[PDB]
Write a protein that binds this DNA or RNA. Structure first.
Lengths: 164, 147, 131, 97
RNA sequence: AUACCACACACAAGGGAUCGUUUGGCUCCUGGGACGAGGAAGGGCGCAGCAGAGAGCGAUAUGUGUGGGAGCAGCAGCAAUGACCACACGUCCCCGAAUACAGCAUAGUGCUGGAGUACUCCUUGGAAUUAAGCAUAUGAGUAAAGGAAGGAAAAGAAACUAACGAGGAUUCCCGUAGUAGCGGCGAGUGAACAGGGAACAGUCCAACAGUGUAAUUCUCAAAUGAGAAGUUGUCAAAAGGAAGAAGAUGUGAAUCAGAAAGAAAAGCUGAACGAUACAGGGUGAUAGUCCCGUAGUGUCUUCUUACAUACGGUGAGUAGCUGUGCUCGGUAAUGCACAGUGAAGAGGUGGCAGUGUGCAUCUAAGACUAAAUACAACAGGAGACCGAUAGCAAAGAAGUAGGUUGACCGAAAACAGUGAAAUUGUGUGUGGACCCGAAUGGAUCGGGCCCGUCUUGAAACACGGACCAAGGAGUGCACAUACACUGCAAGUUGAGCAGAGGAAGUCUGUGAGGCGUAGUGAAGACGGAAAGCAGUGUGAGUGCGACCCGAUAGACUUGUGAACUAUA
RNA sequence: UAGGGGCGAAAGACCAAUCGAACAGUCUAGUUGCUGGUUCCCUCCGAAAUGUCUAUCAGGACAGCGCGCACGCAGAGAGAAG
C-alpha cells in the first residue's frame, strides 16, 4: 500500500459469497403485464385494485406528507352509513388493527368513502355492461398528489393579527 | 477523449512489463490490506492519516437518522426560493410575501448576507439564529416559529 | 417476415430436420411439378414420383430427355430414369440418379392406390376452399 | 453532514391537533361475571385438596416470628423477581389471617 | 575432394501446418419438475436368414387396435391378402429395498422400507488462509458427514414498531449503510425502523354442545332388526359454472428463353409475373416464382376454477431467576440449550445495570394459509460465443478402448479436399562454419568470440537451449481517486417500478434516495470565504485464482488395504 | 488385529517395488519478502545504488534524483567589490 487514499475497506474475503445478475429483467416485466391482463378479464367490469385510505407519514422528516394506507377502520365505515360486509362486496379494503386518534384524520377518510360511493354504477349481469361498452378503470384509485404550494401575499395591516 | 488505447498494448516485446529487472513483480512484497501500520508502514500513517489509531467520543447504541435530519438556509437566499416570475411581482406590488421554509424542506434559518429586497417579509421556520431575527426585524418583517 | 416464435430460423436446426426426416416427412421430399395439361386433368399441382410414371428432365447433363421411372432411392434422395446412364472403362453401364426437383411429370402411373391418394388430396382442398 | 443542527428545545415542538376521547369499556355483562366467579371458585378447591408447598411453609413460619426482611430475601431467591416476591408475600399473609 | 561435408534451385519421397467447411459444444431466456412391494433405479443373460460392437426388444423377444400409405440400403427372398411410419394397449427371463421379512395402525382394507437430493428445511462441525511471527480473532456457522419433503420449500396475520399531527400479516425489489456499533478498538467485521414499489386474504382448536333421553361414526341384515366404537365425551351444513390457458393438425400466390463458356447455371443477358407471404432450409456455382416452408386463415383435444349454522378474554415443569457452555452487530446479555430453583391470573415490551411511580403499545407457552421469490436432470427458442492441440473428458460402437488388489482413474481418431516446415534421394551449380563492408578473368583483402538471463563485472572452466510446426503469460467486477472529453447548472441523476409499442432495442410517466448549495466542537450548543451532479475512457491503490508456473506441509470422510510382509 | 492406529527375540524395523505417521479423493488454482519466463515498428526525454524509521539486514514505507500535463516568469552549478 502506497500513496494517499481513503483507507480501503472492500468486503470480498468470503469465498462462499453469491452473485445475482439481472438478465431476466425485461422478460419478467412482460410476464407481469400478461398476468394483469388476464386477471382483468376474469372480473371484467370491476377495477383490478381496491380503495385504500389516506394516512400521514411517520417521522418529523415526513409529517407534512400524506400517503396511501392498508385499510379503512370499522368507525370510518360505520360513520359513512355502510356495514363491513357491504363494503367488501363493493371493493373497499378493511383494517381492524388501525386506531383513530384525531378529528381531522377521521373527517378526511369519511369524505373518500362518500365520494367513491357516488361515482359507482351497478349492473344486473356481465352482458349488460358488455352491451353498454363500459371501459374498465386501470391503476390505483384516487391517489394523493402532494405538490409544492404557491406563495400567498398579505396586506401590511394583517401582519399584526395573523402571522401566515 | 471518449476512447484511447491502453498501455499494456505498447509493452509487447519489452521483457519486464515495466516493473524492473532487479525489483521484479512478486506477489505481495509489503503485506496484505492496510496492515503493518504501527510497524513498517508507520511513515505513511504519520504523514497522511495521523488520527487513525485512537478511540474518541460519546456512544449511543442505537440512533435514528429521521429524528435528527435537518437542512439550513441563509437570509440572503430567502427571496430565491420563489420562482423568478413570482419574485418580479412582489418586488413592485404593495402586498407582503409569506414564505414557509417547511415547503422546500428547510427547517433552520441562518444570518448570512443581506436580504435581496429591502421590503417586509413573513418567514416561517422551526428555528432562527439571533443574527437572522435582527435582520428580518430591521426591514419590518416577522419571524414565526412553527412545528 | 416470420412472427411465430415456435418455428426455428437456425441454419443448424433446419439442416438437421432435413437429413434426419422419416415416415411421411421423407415422402414430402420426393415431390415434383406436374405439366400444364395434367393440372387441368387433376386438381393437384405436385405429387410424389413413383415407379412407372413418365418424366421430362429439365436440368443437368440429361436435359430434354424423357423416360420411365425405374427406382426411387429414399436414403440417398435420387430417382433413376430409363436411359440416363454412364459407361465405365469395362463398357458396363450404370444408371445415374437425378434429384426429384429437376424432373417434371408427363404421364402418371395409376397402378394400386394412386387414384385414392389423389382423391384424398382434392377433397382436403375443397373442404376449406368453399368455406 | 445534514445531521445535528437543531437544539433539543425546538425538536420538542408539536402541531396543535384536536383529539378524540377513548371509549371506556367498564360495563361487564352478567355472563362474564359468572364466568369469573367459577374460575375463582375452582382455585379454592385445589388449595383445599392438596395444601401448601415446602417453601410456602418455610415462608409462613418466618412471618409468625416477624422475620420480615429474612422472608423478603428468601422469597426473592426462590422466585427471581422482586415483584413476584412482593405479591406472593401479600397472598400468604392474607391466608394466615 | 572424382565420391566426404555445407548451401541454393528443379523433380521425387516424409510429415500433417494453413485456408475453405461443420446433423457438435457453451452461455442466456422460457416451459417442465412426471419413480418404487401393481417389485423401482442399477447390474447380468438371451432374441436377426446370413449378425461381433452399439441401438431396439423379453421365450408373444416386429402381437392387437386406430390414422395413414410404397417400398424393405448389401445378397437372397418378401409386399394393396399392406412394405414402412406415428400414436396408444397387450406381453415383460434372472439378481437387486429383495421380503414365505421387520416394525406399526384399524371394525376391516392396510402403511413404511429403496432410488433421487441443483434449489428449501433440521442437526453436526474443520483446516489450509489473513493478521507480513502467533496463541483471542479471521476464513465460517463455510467445506465434509448425517436426517427429511415438494414442485417449489420455509415464513406468515403482532406477548410488533414508534414517540410522529404516527403507523399496521408474511415474502421479494430500490434504499437507510460500509452507517449505529462489535473488535490483541489490530487485521477485519456489521444490522433495524422510515421513505418509493411488486403482490395482496385471512381464519381454526382448547377453555365452552340439545339432558322431556348420544341427537354421532361404522358393519350385517332388512324394509325395519341385530352387533362394534363411544359418557375418561361423539356430534357446529350446499349443489352449482362459464370463462381462462396450453398444445396438436389442415390449407396456403406467382417463369420462361438465349450467344459465349462450363462436368453441371440458379450466374450473366432480354422479356415477363406474385406480395397481408423478400424469415430460414434444400436443389450439380450466388433462386420471391423448381422442392419444404413463411404471412394470412381454418378445425379439434386436454387442463384450471366457483354459495350456509354455536362462541372469547387464565394454553405451566411454561415464562422467569442463579450458575454454566455455545452464539449474535446486540454492547453491565441478541438468541438457543443443560442442571438447580420455579410464578401470577393477570402478564409482556419501550437497543444503557438497579429500585420506585404515572404514561404508551401489545397478549407468549396450541394450529392452518394463496399470490408476488429460488434452482438440476428433461424439452423448446435465441446469440457482436468456440470452430477439431479449440468448444463439455467425449462432433464416430465416450465415461468407450484400456488400467488399480481395492477405493477409484481414463485417451486418441472430422472431409477417401488443399498439402507448409523439420528431414531424405537424384540432377545441376557454388563453396570448405557463418555474418557485415568492397571487388576480380583469377589467387581474396578489412572488421567481427554465443545467444537469452541474474550481476560491480560474462566469450567464459556460471546456468537454460539437438531440430521444425502449432498452443503459450497484466484480465474481469466492487469502492474511493487525479486527469482528458460531454450535457445541464444552485442544482443534478437510465433507483426500482408503471403506461405505449408484432419488442431482451426504443419512447413517455410516476417517484424515493444520495451527494451539493457554509462551517466549529467529545457533546450540550453555536454559526461568518471558495460549483456541483451524472457519464464515456486512460494512468494508479486495495480485496477476490488477480501477470504465468512451482513447495515440504495442515485438515476432513458412514471411502479402501494383512494376495507382499509382522504377530496370535 | 487398520492409520496418531496395528504389529515388533527392538533395527524407528515392517503394514501391496511407498513408512521418524499408508493409500484414494476433496477442501485447493493452499501460501511464497525466493528461482525461471513474460510475444510488433519508428520518434523524443532520461535515472539510482544515498538519508530517517522498521523482529530490520536477499523485503517495505517516507524523503531525494526521471517523465507527462503545465498556471505563470527576470533569472544564473562563473567571476569581481565590500
Amino acid at each position: 500500500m502506497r500513496g494517499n487514499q481513503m483507507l480501503p475497506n472492500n468486503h470480498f474475503n468470503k469465498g462462499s459469497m453469491k452473485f445475482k445478475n439481472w438478465f431476466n429483467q425485461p422478460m419478467r416485466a412482460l410476464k407481469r403485464k400478461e398476468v394483469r391482463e388476464q386477471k382483468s378479464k376474469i372480473c371484467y367490469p370491476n377495477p383490478l385494485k381496491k380503495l385504500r385510505p389516506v394516512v400521514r407519514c411517520c417521522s418529523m422528516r415526513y409529517n407534512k406528507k400524506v400517503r396511501l394506507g392498508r385499510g379503512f377502520t370499522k368507525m370510518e365505515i360505520e360513520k359513512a352509513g355502510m356495514d363491513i360486509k357491504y363494503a367488501i362486496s363493493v371493493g373497499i379494503a378493511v383494517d381492524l388493527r388501525r386506531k383513530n386518534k384525531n378529528e381531522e384524520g377521521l373527517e378526511e377518510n369519511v369524505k373518500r368513502l362518500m365520494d367513491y360511493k357516488n361515482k359507482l354504477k351497478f349492473f344486473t349481469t356481465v352482458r349488460e355492461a358488455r352491451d353498454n361498452k363500459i371501459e374498465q378503470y386501470k391503476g390505483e384509485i384516487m391517489k394523493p398528489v402532494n405538490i409544492i404550494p404557491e406563495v400567498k401575499g398579505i396586506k401590511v395591516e394583517e401582519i399584526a393579527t395573523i402571522y401566515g | 477523449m471518449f476512447n484511447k488505447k491502453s498501455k499494456s498494448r505498447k509493452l509487447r516485446g519489452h521483457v519486464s512489463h515495466g516493473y524492473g529487472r532487479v525489483g521484479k513483480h512478486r506477489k505481495h512484497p509489503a503485506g496484505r490490506g492496510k496492515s503493518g501500520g504501527l510497524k513498517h508502514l508507520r511513515s505513511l500513517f504519520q504523514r497522511y492519516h495521523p488520527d487513525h489509531f485512537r478511540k474518541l467520543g460519546i456512544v449511543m447504541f442505537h440512533r435514528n437518522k429521521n429524528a435528527d435530519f435537518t437542512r439550513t438556509v441563509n437570509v440572503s437566499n430567502l427571496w430565491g426560493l420563489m420562482k423568478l416570475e413570482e419574485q418580479m411581482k412582489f418586488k413592485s406590488s404593495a402586498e407582503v410575501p409569506v414564505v414557509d421554509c417547511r415547503n422546500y424542506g428547510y427547517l433552520k434559518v441562518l444570518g448570512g448576507g443581506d436580504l435581496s429586497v429591502k421590503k417586509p417579509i413573513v418567514v416561517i421556520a422551526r428555528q432562527f439564529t439571533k443574527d437572522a431575527e435582527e435582520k428580518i426585524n430591521a426591514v419590518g418583517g416577522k419571524c414565526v416559529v412553527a412545528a | 417476415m416470420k412472427f411465430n416464435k415456435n418455428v426455428t430460423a437456425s441454419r443448424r436446426k433446419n439442416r438437421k430436420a432435413h437429413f434426419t426426416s422419416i415416415g411421411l416427412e421423407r415422402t414430402k421430399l420426393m415431390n415434383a411439378p406436374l405439366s400444364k395439361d395434367l393440372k387441368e386433368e387433376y386438381g393437384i399441382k405436385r405429387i410424389a414420383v413413383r415407379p412407372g410414371d413418365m418424366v421430362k428432365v429439365v436440368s443437368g447433363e440429361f436435359k430434354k430427355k424423357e423416360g420411365v421411372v425405374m427406382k426411387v432411392n429414399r436414403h440417398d434422395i435420387k430417382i433413376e430414369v430409363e436411359g440416363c446412364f454412364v459407361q465405365k472403362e469395362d463398357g458396363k453401364k450404370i444408371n445415374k440418379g437425378i434429384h426429384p426437383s429437376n424432373l417434371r411429370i408427363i404421364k402418371l402411373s395409376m397402378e394400386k392406390d394412386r387414384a385414392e391418394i389423389i382423391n384424398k388430396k382434392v377433397e382436403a382442398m375443397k373442404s376449406e376452399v368453399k368455406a | 453532514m445534514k445531521i445535528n443542527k437543531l437544539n433539543n428545545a425546538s425538536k420538542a415542538l408539536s402541531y396543535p391537533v384536536k383529539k378524540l376521547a377513548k371509549t371506556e369499556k367498564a360495563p361487564l355483562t352478567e355472563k362474564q361475571q359468572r364466568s369469573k366467579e367459577l374460575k375463582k371458585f375452582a382455585m379454592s378447591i385445589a388449595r383445599e385438596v392438596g395444601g401448601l408447598a415446602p417453601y410456602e411453609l418455610r415462608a409462613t413460619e418466618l412471618l409468625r416470628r416477624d422475620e420480615d426482611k429474612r422472608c423478603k430475601k428468601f422469597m426473592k431467591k426462590r422466585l427471581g423477581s422482586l415483584k413476584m416476591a412482593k405479591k406472593k408475600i401479600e397472598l400468604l399473609a392474607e391466608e394466615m389471617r
